[PDB]
Ligand binder design. Structure first.
Ligand SMILES: C[C@H](CCC[C@@H](C)CC(=O)O)CC[C@H]1[C@@H](C)CC=CC1(C)C
Ligand SMILES: C[C@H](CCC[C@@H](C)CC(=O)O)CC[C@H]1[C@@H](C)CC=CC1(C)C
Lengths: 11, 213, 213, 11
């Protein structure tokens, strides 16, 4: 869904 | 447990032809920095990942508006972007967005300026915004409500200790939040229009924030 | 100078097939009562007439929403109109307005209920809303800001005295105002649509509130 | 302009 946000929040 | 010192540290850690294009470009860049800010707010990264997403998607525009507004306190009739560019109200007016720009100046920047809102205070208000227990889809609203409560408890203590001669200061800070909410909503309407009409390049992260829901 | 007793008296003095039609009819009727309420709030009638108009035009929807919300505290999953009619969420959903109705229930009514917001508190919050110094066109914003300040000063004193064991109560009340602002704005968008599309009779006073500006 | 409101507020 919200791929950039998820990636930045992961770690 | 929610030390204003950690909140201040978060603010400090993150400090840096069409004005609409320049503002949107800057907002996209500041969304990356926003994520790094939120991670430095106590207990935020311990929330479930889906709830971190919900809170940032619900609050990003108010959080970014608060930030540029306070950054702009010493600017006459304009704002200062994180890119270092100053945007004056004359330029906003000449681009068709004078009304909302003037609300920002009159309801946020000038008021922050008039009361000398400090960075700890700004930081706490933003943390309150971030921990919005009304955000839809939250796995545990009560947990977020509890975090919001700890932040405002710490803010009041900070204010009563730092500015004992201003007993209404705490209320004054909290009472800029309805204005911030209203302005953020109007800015979103504008962004959705720019997207619809194609009048402005919108970068990938900003675009993602405009995606459904 | 801004006695919570006078504010409570104002609240007490005023106490009483398509749910959208029934709600709009009730809102029109309550706009008359709203004017009589505002007159009972200390210092409001001493403002210039043009400023009284500005404040009521800027605040009517938030003021009416606060009122029906608090009236609805003991209602399960619905609201109680001043006409005495109860509207349940099922009916709102089946009329196409379930989302906004659910925000009202979740963000306002249930929260008022959960904290047992009292009528003095409701009255003060409404007086804060009424005295909105950000309203555009005000002949003297500072005067209205001063009146807002006296109300929140009196509210905090009331809370600290009535509920000394809840030191966050004051902040908790003020932090329902951004939700109220957001919900009021969305309700206005809906009303403008009902007007545009013709799907609902809109009575004269409500219609006037929807007129420009 | 806003005729009902003005009238109700007058007196
Ligand atoms: C919602 C964004 C977020 C801005 C953040 C940056 C200023 C980032 C930074 O440089 O701090 C602003 C949107 C507005 C407005 C305010 C200026 C005129 C129209 C908009 C373009 C709709
Ligand atoms: C903005 C008005 C004011 C209502 C006041 C009355 C309830 C008066 C009274 O009976 O206390 C409500 C508007 C909403 C909403 C809430 C219910 C569903 C859609 C609307 C029709 C858009």
């Amino acid at each position: 869904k919200h791929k950039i946000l998820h990636r930045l929040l992961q770690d | 447990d929610m030390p204003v010192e950690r909140i201040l540290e978060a603010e400090l850690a993150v400090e840096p032809n069409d004005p609409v294009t320049n503002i949107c470009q800057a907002a996209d860049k500041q969304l990356f920095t926003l994520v790094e800010w939120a991670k430095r707010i106590p207990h935020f990264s311990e929330l479930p990942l889906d709830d971190q997403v919900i809170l940032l998607r619900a609050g990003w525009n108010e959080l970014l508006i608060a930030s540029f507004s306070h950054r702009s306190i010493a600017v006459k009739d304009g704002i200062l972007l994180a890119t270092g560019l100053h945007v004056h109200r004359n330029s906003a007016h000449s681009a068709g967005v004078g009304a909302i720009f003037d609300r920002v100046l009159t309801e946020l920047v000038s008021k922050m300026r008039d009361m000398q809102m400090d960075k700890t205070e700004l930081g706490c208000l933003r943390a309150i915004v971030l921990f919005n227990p009304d955000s839809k889809g939250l796995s545990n609203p009560a947990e977020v409500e509890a975090l919001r409560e700890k932040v405002y408890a710490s803010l009041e203590a900070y204010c009563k200790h730092k500015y004992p001669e201003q007993p209404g200061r705490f209320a004054k800070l909290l009472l800029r939040l309805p204005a911030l909410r209203s302005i953020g909503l109007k800015c979103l309407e504008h962004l959705f229009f720019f997207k619809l009409i194609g009048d402005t390049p919108i970068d990938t992260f900003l675009m993602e924030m405009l995606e459904a829901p």
